[PDB]
Design a binder for this molecule. Structure first.
Ligand SMILES: *[C@@H]1O[C@H](CO)[C@@H](O[C@@H]2O[C@H](CO)[C@@H](O)[C@H](O)[C@H]2NC(C)=O)[C@H](O)[C@H]1NC(C)=O
Ligand SMILES: *[C@@H]1O[C@H](CO)[C@@H](O[C@@H]2O[C@H](CO)[C@@H](O)[C@H](O)[C@H]2NC(C)=O)[C@H](O)[C@H]1NC(C)=O
Ligand code: 55B
Ligand code: NAG
Ligand code: NAG
Ligand code: NAG
Ligand code: NAG
Ligand code: NAG
Ligand code: CU
Ligand code: CU
Ligand code: CU
Ligand code: CU
Length: 547
């Protein structure tokens, strides 16, 4: 239950391009954290790299413990080069696959890895024990330094350059230059069942994923078991994890191919904007098969087309929490407070005496309820703890300031603009929230993977168009809604979720597309202390990084 994570400058080559990246213990992707349910894991982080950095344990509630949550300028100031910081990871309700990643600038492009939470001693999976288990991390690679990719977009105000490759476990696969020799491969035996722990650690796109010749029985997401269902492909958004069983029963007598492509490719609908639409591949190989069976290329799966919204919708519609005596559910039935949160990509005016590259030669930005989040220089949590004025404003609104036909295509150019601010939403301990995410069509309808630190939540409804507060709740799933930490909000639509705010602390909420995070598609919940020691935020650790 103890790890040393040294942030290292590491030389890595992909697509024949060598660069120095930040990595953890010289590994890209980084090491897997292994835990069992309810473990407490300690990670000593030594920053031996060239820049400020933080780490985040994605999907771990961290009850009463925002100090170890990681988001830069939200719960901590950064770990400076040459400094260290000890994170305490408190696992509670989570069982399944999570992941960890840098939470500073675009550093998670290379600084990320898996978290595996096994059933605790004396318990077992709700499904037959898989023969083997394999993390499958989907990601992106840029040939350029990712710091330079970010800085350039900061300077121009235009869109972030697309990645040069999509990757599986850091490897682009068979169809990228200088990549076929090191394509990720996994061995399977006929008749055995394998648990694929799929993590979308990319920065930019939701992804379709499939394995040629093999159906996938999805059994969990975001650390919570799902009602099992079997499919030919999945959709997975950045931030999400999805666990699924693969049954390796293809013929090993030579009558069938012995190699099958695992493949992923974006789900992306904005036909106006560029995208890294390159597929990424890995190989599932039946090892106990004759050498003649691997003669030709591996079989390829049918992936949905990149703009196939129906295929995305059809996968997401199947997600339901597993509800059993061993795995019960607690859907909040009586809501204390409703929020409607509009999600938009925006512009702000270009700074004086400069030309910008965003829409209308303005600067790109993003907003929640038309507030474009701006990081403070004293982190929110310290400001909250020490009652430091002039850092944040506790009046993030429950509703957008101006109602309009949110999802009507091509809104007028005046609706592009937003306004920066550092606003948070303060709630009393135990408040039951229904948060309805509403995509707008400003600068293009787009599916946003909204993520809440400190909590998972029940996704009780979703639909296309404008959420109707007087009709859509009538068909909410209040019985077994999926319990997620990151929700794919529909393209040009809405998603409703509920949770009890019973974790005292300072909790970031943001789109898990990093470009939208930096552009300001974020806010913060401050959950006040309740009554009782168990409802008290932990005290500040002695060696928090200085601001
Ligand atoms: C989001 O906020 C921006 C900035 O406050 C709003 O844009 C302003 O709109 C008013 C008229 O309502 C103009 O007088 C200002 O000049 C605008 N500011 C600009 C263009 O920077 C925008 O209307 C809001 N959008 C919403 C609420 O959807
Ligand atoms: C790395 O992080 C540190 C801590 O946030 C930054 O140092 C602070 O910079 C602000 C300017 O915004 C000063 O007001 C503080 O006095 C600094 N605190 C220190 C030095 O402890 C530093 O700027 C960051 N580096 C980069 C490149 O962003
Ligand atoms: C739909 O919102 C976007 C608009 C734009 C428009 C950019 C024009 O400069 C870019 C984006 O990044 C991929 C967006 O996510
Ligand atoms: C880590 O940082 C602390 C300062 O907070 C320092 O005292 C210590 O020597 C550093 N190195 C370790 C713990 O190995
Ligand atoms: C981003 O892409 C453009 C090509 O569209 C290229 O000119 C530019 O150099 C790229 N930026 C970086 C930092 O590589
Ligand atoms: C991936 O893309 C390459 C290049 O377009 C294509 O030849 C190959 O068939 C694709 N693979 C799959 C599994 O779709
Ligand atoms: C900077 O912008 C102002 C306002 O548009 C303009 O009057 C001034 O000439 C500019 N400075 C230059 C071009 O050096
Ligand atoms: C809102 O916009 C949609 C899409 O154009 C349109 O079908 C609908 O009629 C509009 N609703 C109202 C009330 O104008
Ligand atoms: Cu995350
Ligand atoms: Cu998170
Ligand atoms: Cu986050
Ligand atoms: Cu987004």
């Amino acid at each position: 239950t103890h790890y040393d994570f040294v942030i290292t400058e590491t030389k890595v080559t992909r697509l024949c391009h060598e660069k120095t990246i930040l990595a953890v213990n010289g590994q890209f992707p980084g090491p897997t954290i292994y835990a069992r349910k309810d473990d407490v894991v300690i990670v000593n982080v030594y920053n031996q790299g060239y820049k400020n950095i933080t780490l985040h344990w994605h999907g771990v509630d961290q009850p009463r413990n925002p100090w170890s949550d990681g988001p830069e300028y939200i719960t901590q100031c950064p770990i400076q080069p040459g400094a260290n910081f000890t994170y305490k990871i408190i696992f509670t309700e989570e069982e399944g696959t999570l992941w960890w990643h840098a939470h500073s600038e675009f550093d998670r492009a290379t600084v990320h890895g898996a978290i595996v939470i096994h059933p605790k001693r004396g318990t077992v999976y709700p499904y037959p024990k898989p023969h083997k288990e394999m993390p499958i991390i989907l990601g992106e690679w840029w040939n350029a330094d990712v710091e330079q990719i970010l800085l350039e977009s900061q300077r121009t105000g235009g869109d972030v350059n697309i990645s040069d490759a999509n990757t599986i476990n850091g490897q682009p696969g068979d169809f990228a230059p200088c990549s076929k020799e090191d394509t990720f491969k996994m061995s399977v035996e006929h008749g055995k069942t394998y648990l694929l722990r799929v993590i979308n650690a990319g920065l930019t796109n939701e992804m379709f994923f499939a394995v040629a010749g093999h159906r996938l029985t999805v059994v969990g997401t975001d650390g919570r078991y799902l009602r099992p269902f079997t499919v030919d492909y999945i959709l997975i958004s950045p931030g999400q994890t999805m666990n699924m069983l693969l049954e390796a029963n293809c013929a090993t007598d030579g009558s069938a191919n012995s190699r099958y492509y695992m493949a992923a490719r974006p789900f992306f609908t904005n036909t106006a904007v560029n995208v890294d639409d390159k597929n990424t591949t890995a190989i599932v190989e039946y090892t106990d098969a004759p050498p003649s069976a691997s003669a030709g290329p591996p079989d390829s799966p049918d992936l949905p087309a990149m703009d196939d919204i129906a295929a995305a919708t059809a996968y997401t519609a199947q997600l339901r929490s597993l509800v059993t005596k061993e795995h019960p559910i607690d859907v909040p039935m009586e809501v204390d407070e409703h929020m409607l949160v509009t999600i938009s990509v925006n512009t702000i005016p270009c700074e004086p005496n400069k030309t910008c590259a965003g829409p209308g030669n303005n600067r790109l930005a993003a907003s929640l309820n038309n507030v474009s989040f701006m990081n403070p220089t004293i982190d929110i949590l310290d400001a909250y703890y020490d009652s430091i004025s002039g850092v944040y404003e506790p009046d993030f609104p429950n509703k957008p300031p101006f109602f309009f036909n949110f999802t009507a295509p091509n809104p007028p150019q005046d609706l592009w603009f937003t306004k920066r601010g550092t606003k948070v939403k303060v709630v009393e301990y135990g408040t039951i929230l229904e948060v309805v995410f509403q995509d707008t069509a400003i600068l293009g309808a787009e599916s946003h993977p909204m993520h809440l630190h400190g909590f998972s939540f029940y996704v009780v409804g979703r639909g296309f168009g404008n959420f109707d507060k007087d009709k859509d709740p009538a068909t909410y799933n209040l019985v077994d809604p999926p319990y997620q930490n990151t929700v794919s909000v529909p393209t040009g639509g809405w998603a409703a979720m509920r949770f009890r705010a019973a974790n005292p602390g300072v909790w970031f909420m943001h789109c898990h597309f990093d470009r939208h995070t930096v552009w300001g598609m974020d806010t913060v919940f401050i959950v006040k202390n309740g009554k009782g020691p168990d409802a008290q935020m932990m005290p500040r650790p002695p060696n928090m990084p200085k601001c």
